[PDB]
Write a protein that binds this ligand. Structure first.
Ligand SMILES: Cc1cc(C)c(Nc2nc(Nc3ccc(C#N)cc3)nc(OCCCN3CCOCC3)n2)c(C)c1
Lengths: 427, 552
């Protein structure tokens, strides 16, 4: 493509040097795929080899987007983002529609191929350097830097925003009810249409974007495949902050009423208007744990009142756009995971529960990875930004295998926890 | 001895300027010694004279070694180094021999002038200027620059490897069979070509390099293969560690123990069963180099154990990509582990161990899991794949644990090895309380000042006991109360405690610990048939709590 307007001048935060991040070691298989991909990109002007005078580095990974046959390069621009986008969230920020979360169906479209046309600022190219590593330190890595807007960079859709809103406008006029939102490499398209028409309307957009130059390889063929559900089609109407259920038993043992209640007494840190005392008067006899204790009048009156009080959500819990989002996840067994998204402790902006299957075909790391992506997509749709996870996993075993079931293009901030709670079935 | 290599463009740190430091006192007659070197360097085009205009002088030194037939002189560039840009960092680690492939023949070439053979960027040479001051009254001294990569300079290492790499490309592309490794001023060439063609090919490579001003030798090595490379010993069919010696003393300084634990770690890559438990537990604190540390009794057995291993020599085999990559782990009881990596029954590619100094309450299955983690990383570095594991654990015991553990855990394909000591689960807490079993409402309390406390219990059978405590803390009494209930109860027992801490230790199912109390409790839990531990809010609880808590 012809070089358009000269390269958009890109500056960074005052006194912030480029990213200098070490390159994770990779399998031979991945280095091979990374090599093919890069000599193919270099062959197309997208990237160029660099010298020892470029001291910066940004990690690279080989994932499998279609995971069918061919690989896909995933640059991790988390560090460079923090060093540039913080002044490209300000200088060129894309506005986040608060209505996207209310649409009946939201489809995600990868439009990452768009950027590969536009040149990047010559003076800025240096900071996009990445290294294809060598096994056993045989050869110093293969070093490239970008010549066009890199995928994974937040600064790319910011620079491409005008061109994108222009391509989209003649579709937004025909369909004024459809909310379209560009987060990085993806468009989030949400309509209140019925499922059948919503997909037909997405295909109209795919073809519209195509006859203006943009490809969107995520579709494959809808005609004749084997049994396989779509990659991404969300329904944010379901997404709320779920209430915590108390055990429904026909009779109660001391132990039952002692494991009481499912986060009560700590729920008093979430729902402050709770009295447990007239339930604590139901034992006081140094009883055998397995002994059955009958209900009294005042005991039921502090249960029924402490039950409908949990189905009435917290008050004063609002989103703070200056505070980062925090997502904690708890492994629950039986192929199930519970999570919470918050900013200040016990003030939950969102809670949900991921569920894969009964088991015997899916391991922990796969589940957690899918859960982190699943949560992150909720965070994007809802607040326009991603959370910082506190993962129930050893650091190195995540840093080894996270890229194995990672189908997403963005990457959230990690963090690893070491102390388990008693708050397992408290959720 | 220089070449028309494309120089690499170099900048200074954005706001900085060239170094304008000097040296006033001189070294007497050692000035003309620096003259003889410079003119001979100038004639070779390495340096160039210049008049003192817009100069950035850099201090100059001269130094002879013992019986030096030829003097050697060099410039301290630390100030300039602080002012020049950062580069792409040179080779982090080194290629580990266990992951090299065997060849019919290998050669090693030492590049001559190395740094002075590669030109320096023109617009940057102004900053490498230095002076040769003569006599007094500030008479016009001799001032030069550098036309090539200066010896000590910050950019010399990375620029050289960049040049060398570019220079090898028109030969590597004329020789796909030959593989070449670069490393510092060294070059390590190998091939499966028959020794005739290989000797010719090495000679072609030399003549290539020589026409690019890089001098290389025809016969230089003071010692032939095996190669005394990097603490290693590389033979044509095997690799091993360059011989190390564990020195014997009567008194041990921290530095000497610092050296010893390093020489042992460096040996642990091939010599199986090396231990650094009590030898490292001495360097825990307080750290002071010249301080003399008394050698403990257990630390002396360990050293004796390691000496017995280091006695006879052991070697490792190289990598065959066509054959499986197996790794097997053995437990060594005291929190330490060992592993071997191999493709063949009687030879190892390498060995190694796992530290495990995390926390004060740990578990055998978790430790094993961390070992599989450490090895998978090491495998991915050296060979670029993950090994098939051979592990001393039943699949029932593994399955039970990861299903029960709060963290996510993953483990690649692994097979059980019946060879003891096995990794078991020495006890499992009941998930539900036990009908017919006595209930022990325990609680422990203490004073953080008097350091006195009480550990007691009260049961549903009406039984009660309270034991006084000294030298204790609220966390010690909270566990002592549990331990007491176990002592006094039958083969099945329900225990109720008000301590998140206590329940925390027990529910972690540790089989070993660094607390004698916790270990004793473990012994009881193994001996009991069924144990259910239950939690209850401390302050506002049932009422059987403050019955022994209000005693303190
Ligand atoms: C001190 C030193 C000396 C040399 C020559 C090397 N290089 C080197 N060593 C070996 N092993 C060896 C060492 C010493 C002796 C003796 N005597 C016999 C075999 N195999 C290769 O080359 C292996 C090439 C494998 N491939 C081929 C292409 O894909 C990438 C890697 N390169 C090294 C790494 C260190």
């Amino acid at each position: 493509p012809i070089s358009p307007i000269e390269t958009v001048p890109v500056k960074l935060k005052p006194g912030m040097d480029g990213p200098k991040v070490k390159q994770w070691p990779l399998t031979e298989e991945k280095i091979k795929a990374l090599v093919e991909i890069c000599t193919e990109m270099e062959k197309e002007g997208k990237i160029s080899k660099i010298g020892p005078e470029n001291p910066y580095n940004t990690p690279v990974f080989a994932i499998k987007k279609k995971d069918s046959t061919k690989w896909r390069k995933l640059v991790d621009f988390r560090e460079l983002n923090k060093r540039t986008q913080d002044f490209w969230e300000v200088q060129l920020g894309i506005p986040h529609p608060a209505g996207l979360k209310k649409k009946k169906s939201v489809t995600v479209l990868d439009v990452g191929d768009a950027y590969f046309s536009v040149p990047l600022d010559e003076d800025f190219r240096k900071y996009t350097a990445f290294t294809i590593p060598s096994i056993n330190n045989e050869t110093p890595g293969i070093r490239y830097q970008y010549n066009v807007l890199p995928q994974g960079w937040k600064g790319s859709p910011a620079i491409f925003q005008s061109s994108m809103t222009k391509i989209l406008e003649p579709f937004k006029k025909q369909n004024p009810d459809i909310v379209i939102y560009q987060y990085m490499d993806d468009l989030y398209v949400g309509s209140d249409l019925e499922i059948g028409q919503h997909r037909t309307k997405i295909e109209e957009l795919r073809q519209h974007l195509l006859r203006w130059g943009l490809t969107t390889p995520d579709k494959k063929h809808q005609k004749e495949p084997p049994f396989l559900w779509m990659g991404y089609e969300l329904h944010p109407d379901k997404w709320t902050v779920q209430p915590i259920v108390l055990p429904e038993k026909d009779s109660w043992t001391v132990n039952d009423i002692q494991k009481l209640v499912g986060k009560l007494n700590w729920a008093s840190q979430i729902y402050p208007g709770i009295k447990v005392r007239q339930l604590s008067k139901l034992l006081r006899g140094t009883k055998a744990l397995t002994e059955v204790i009958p209900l009294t009048e005042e005991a039921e009156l502090e249960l029924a009142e402490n039950r409908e009080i949990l189905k009435e959500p917290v008050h004063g819990v609002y989103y703070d756009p200056s505070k980062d989002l925090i997502a904690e996840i708890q492994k629950q067994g039986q192929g199930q995971w519970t999570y919470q998204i918050y900013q200040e402790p016990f003030k939950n902006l969102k809670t949900g529960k991921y569920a894969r299957m009964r088991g015997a075909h899916t391991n922990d790391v796969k589940q957690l990875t899918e859960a982190v992506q699943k949560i992150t997509t909720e965070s994007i749709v809802i607040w326009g930004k991603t959370p910082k996870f506190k993962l129930p996993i050893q650091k190195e075993t995540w840093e080894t295998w996270w890229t194995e079931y990672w189908q997403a293009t963005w990457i959230p901030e990690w963090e690893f926890v070491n102390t388990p709670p008693l708050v397992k079935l408290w959720y | 001895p220089i070449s028309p290599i494309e120089t690499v463009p170099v900048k200074l740190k954005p706001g900085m300027d060239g170094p304008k430091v000097k040296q006033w006192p001189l070294t007497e007659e050692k000035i003309k010694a620096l003259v003889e070197i410079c003119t001979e360097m100038e004639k070779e085009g390495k340096i160039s004279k210049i008049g003192p205009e817009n100069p950035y002088n850099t201090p100059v030194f001269a130094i002879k070694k013992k019986d030096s037939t030829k003097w050697r002189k060099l410039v301290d560039f630390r100030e300039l180094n602080k002012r020049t840009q950062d580069f792409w960092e040179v080779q982090l680690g080194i290629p580990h021999p266990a992951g090299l492939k065997k060849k019919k023949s290998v050669t090693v070439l030492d590049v001559g002038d190395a740094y002075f053979s590669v030109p320096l960027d023109e617009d940057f040479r102004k900053y490498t200027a230095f002076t040769i001051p003569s006599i007094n009254n500030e008479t016009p001294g001799i001032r030069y620059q550098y036309n090539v990569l200066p010896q000590g300079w910050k950019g010399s290492p990375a620029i050289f490897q960049s040049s060398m790499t570019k220079i090898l490309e028109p030969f590597a592309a004329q020789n796909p069979d030959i593989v070449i490794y670069q490393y510092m001023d060294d070059l390590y060439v190998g091939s499966d070509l028959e020794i005739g063609q290989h000797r010719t090919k090495i000679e072609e490579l030399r003549q290539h390099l020589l026409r690019w001003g890089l001098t290389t030798p025809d016969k230089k090595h003071q010692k032939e293969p095996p190669f005394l490379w990097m603490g290693y010993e590389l033979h044509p069919d095997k690799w091993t560690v360059q011989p190390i010696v564990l020195p014997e003393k009567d008194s041990w300084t921290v530095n000497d123990i610092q050296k010893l634990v390093g020489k042992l770690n460096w040996a642990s890559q091939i010599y199986p069963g090396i231990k650094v438990r009590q030898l490292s537990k001495l360097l825990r604190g307080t750290k002071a180099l010249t301080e003399v540390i008394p050698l403990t009794e257990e630390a002396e057995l360990e050293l004796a154990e390691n000496r017995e291993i280091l006695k006879e020599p052991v070697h490792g085999v190289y990598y065959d990509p066509s054959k499986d990559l197996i790794a097997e782990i053995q437990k060594q009881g005291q929190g330490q582990w060992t592993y071997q990596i191999y493709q063949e029954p009687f030879k190892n590619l390498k060995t190694g161990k796992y530290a495990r100094m995390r926390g004060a309450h740990t578990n055998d299955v978790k430790q094993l899991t961390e070992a599989v983690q450490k090895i998978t990383t090491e495998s991915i570095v050296i060979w670029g794949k993950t090994p098939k594991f051979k592990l001393p654990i039943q699949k029932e015991t593994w399955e039970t644990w990861w299903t029960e553990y709060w963290q996510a855990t993953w483990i690649p394909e692994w097979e059980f090895v019946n060879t003891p000591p096995l990794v078991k689960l020495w006890y499992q807490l009941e998930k539900e309380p036990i009908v017919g079993a006595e209930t022990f409402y325990v609680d422990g309390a203490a004073n953080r000042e008097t350091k006195l406390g009480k550990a007691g219990y009260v049961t549903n059978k009406g039984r009660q006991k309270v034991v006084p405590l000294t030298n204790t803390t609220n966390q010690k009494t909270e566990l002592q109360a549990i331990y007491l209930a176990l002592q006094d109860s039958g083969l099945e027992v329900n225990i109720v405690t008000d301590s998140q801490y206590a329940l925390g230790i027990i529910q972690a199912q540790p089989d070993k610990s660094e607390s004698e109390l916790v270990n004793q409790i473990i012994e009881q839990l193994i001996k009991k048939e069924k144990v259910y531990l239950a939690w209850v809010p401390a302050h506002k609880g049932i009422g059987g709590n403050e019955q022994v808590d209000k005693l303190v």
